């Protein structure tokens, strides 16, 4: 054979991790990110669309909406590093925002077995989006051209330099 009998024996117990000292602390967003601020979504299926920033969510996300009746962006969350803050501000008072958070944005992800070789929204979500968009529109109409601006998708023209540009 290879060996008769090993006099020296190793151990298979899975070592416990040391007591790490990384205590999480709340995120500090940039000053330009305040609720009721127009944001250009830089990525996703809604890239370049101008939405309204509503609330800072628990998992470092940003609760935004189009409004849906304006540009078609539903009540979603987006990453704060994939939007551009814009100087345009829309008042947020009169709009309820405490309802939505990470538990509201649940998915119940489909199984690994269910393969989409060939291959709907919840009534509560559509209703609360209707209410939130109604309040947002009621406030938005007080500023001219805001609805048209929020419907228009942002884009980079030829000769547009982002490092000199202001939003």
């Amino acid at each position: 054979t290879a060996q008769q009998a090993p006099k020296w024996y190793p151990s298979e117990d899975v070592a416990a991790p040391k007591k790490t000292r990384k205590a999480v602390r709340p995120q500090k967003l940039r000053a330009s990110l305040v609720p009721g601020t127009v944001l250009i979504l830089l990525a996703g299926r809604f890239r370049g669309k101008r939405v309204v920033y509503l609330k800072h969510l628990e998992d470092n996300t940003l609760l935004v909406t189009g409004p849906f009746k304006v540009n078609g962006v539903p009540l979603r969350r987006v990453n704060a590093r994939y939007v551009i803050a814009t100087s345009t501000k829309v008042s947020v008072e009169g709009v309820n925002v405490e309802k939505f958070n990470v538990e509201y944005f649940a998915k119940e992800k489909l199984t690994k077995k269910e393969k989409k070789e060939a291959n709907e929204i919840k009534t509560e979500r559509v209703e609360d989006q209707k209410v939130v968009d109604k309040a947002l529109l009621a406030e938005i109409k007080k500023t001219p051209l805001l609805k048209q601006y929020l419907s228009a998708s942002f884009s980079l023209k030829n000769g547009d330099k982002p490092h000199l540009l202001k939003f």
Binding site: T1, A2, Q3, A5, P6, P10, E12, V14, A15
Partner: protein, 127 residues
């Protein structure tokens, strides 16, 4: 998939081939150090093939580990599987090339019963 170890880093995954083994058929690829007085490889000129050095040595925490993290152990029978019986996460069995077909299926069955991983559970089997 096994005991907590650093990723297996291969500092030099390329084979160290002898100088001019491509130039001449009589020069085999087995590495030999150039002892020539004017040798560019021995003098380590820019653009020439690298030579094996101790600095290429693998991390001692991952040396001899398979891609799966086990250590290969050549076996020839169930008695050879016995020494691995209780170290399933650290060693894997490799049935010797000259084991006959029936003894190979015997070893494979015992390793399957005992949870031991075999690196070649496909030899002498229909494909």
């Amino acid at each position: 998939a096994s005991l907590p170890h650093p990723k297996i880093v291969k500092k030099h995954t390329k084979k160290f081939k002898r100088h001019h083994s491509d130039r001449y058929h009589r020069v085999a690829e087995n590495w030999r150090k150039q002892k020539g007085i004017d040798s560019v490889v021995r003098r380590r000129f820019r653009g020439n093939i690298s030579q094996p050095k101790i600095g290429y040595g693998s991390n001692k925490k991952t040396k001899f580990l398979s891609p799966s993290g086990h250590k290969t152990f050549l076996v020839a029978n169930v008695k050879d599987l016995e020494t691995l019986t209780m170290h399933t996460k650290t060693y894997a069995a490799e049935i010797a090339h000259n084991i006959s077909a029936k003894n190979r299926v015997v070893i494979l069955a015992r390793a399957k019963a005992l949870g031991i991983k075999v690196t070649n559970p496909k030899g002498r089997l229909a494909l």
